[PDB]
Design a protein around this ligand. Structure first.
Ligand SMILES: [Mg+2]
Ligand SMILES: [Mg+2]
Ligand SMILES: [Mg+2]
Ligand SMILES: [Mg+2]
Lengths: 206, 206
């Protein structure tokens, strides 16, 4: 039985993108997080406004993001996984922010959200694809009779891990590991590989 | 504005695997396709029987498939497509038979069928994933709010082409083209790129 391997993106294969981008620009106002502004829509509108006040159009943003690299060992891990499973990346970021990083991973299929860009290359809005997108994606693959094995690093990955046939926690905080013991928790790509092997119904080699 | 490019595999990116396997090994009986035998289940039972009678185990089969390559220009086309869309391959091939070719394409997500391999590495059976598999795959992406643009080369791709938001016939036989006038038909990869640009709701460049 061929399985689909669903991987979260940020914190699993690449650094948290917005935060790294903000740090690279040196603009303190771009660094607010959900802790500073809990309402996600309010946080996003602010980000768009500050980006515009500083003249950072999409091209400028992607230029900065292109200097980021996948986490050490992530490139080999994705290659390893693609020799054994059909690989799909699920992410709560936007196509426009992830692109320079996806390129470095060989553009594996990515299901995430999308920014609204005007004719002057300005980021003017955003669109969330649907509610609980990672979980709904797993459901879609189950509709095609696939067994799904998923891996993620945060609480925002737990509905995906719960929906999959097998879930694995990677670099997760103790807060999550303790609450979701049904998911093996590891923090090295080698151990992550081993968990995918144990979760598979097929006999695969390391 | 969220789009998935679904591509058929054989005829579109790589040669028909069985016809090429026959030309390599000299086993003419393996040239048969659904044109010769309409029931994929019967044709499959026959193909497995012949492989066995020729002592061809899975490892042996793959050594041969590894000598095949993608159609001229297909790799470059997939790379072009992956910079602009999320690319998923929909095929009636089998994972174990197509792997060497899929690796050359950078292992993009492949939704196809699987084989039953025994202890002695013999291909003793197969399992078709579900009925009308390509059409159902398109429906699955629709369930995630994606717009789908599909490309295929034959009669067996038409349910997929009709279900998609936009369908393109590529390298299709004249008969298929004539019977399905609703889909633009092109024969070069540059023209295929152009059809993906026309079908997209986004401003993309060639
Ligand atoms: Mg994450
Ligand atoms: Mg993390
Ligand atoms: Mg075909
Ligand atoms: Mg053809």
């Amino acid at each position: 039985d061929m399985e689909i391997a669903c991987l979260d993106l940020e914190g699993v294969l690449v650094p948290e993108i917005w935060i790294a981008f903000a740090e690279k620009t040196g603009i303190d106002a771009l660094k607010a997080t959900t802790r500073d502004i809990p309402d996600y829509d309010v946080l996003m509108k602010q980000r768009l406004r500050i980006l515009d006040e500083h003249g950072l159009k999409l091209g400028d943003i992607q230029e900065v993001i292109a200097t980021l690299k996948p986490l050490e060992g992530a490139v080999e891990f994705v290659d390893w996984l693609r020799e054994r499973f059909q690989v799909v990346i699920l992410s709560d970021t936007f196509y426009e922010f992830s692109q320079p990083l996806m390129r470095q991973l060989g553009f594996p299929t990515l299901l995430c959200h999308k920014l609204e860009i005007d004719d002057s290359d300005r980021v003017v809005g955003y669109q969330l694809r649907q509610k609980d997108p990672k979980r709904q994606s797993v459901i879609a693959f189950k509709s095609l009779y696939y067994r799904v094995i998923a891996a993620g690093d945060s609480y925002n990955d737990t509905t995906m891990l719960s929906e999959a046939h097998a879930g694995i926690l990677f670099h997760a905080p103790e807060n999550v590991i303790r609450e979701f013991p049904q998911f093996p928790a590891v923090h090295t790509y080698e151990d992550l590989k081993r968990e995918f092997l144990k979760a598979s119904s097929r006999s695969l080699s390391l």
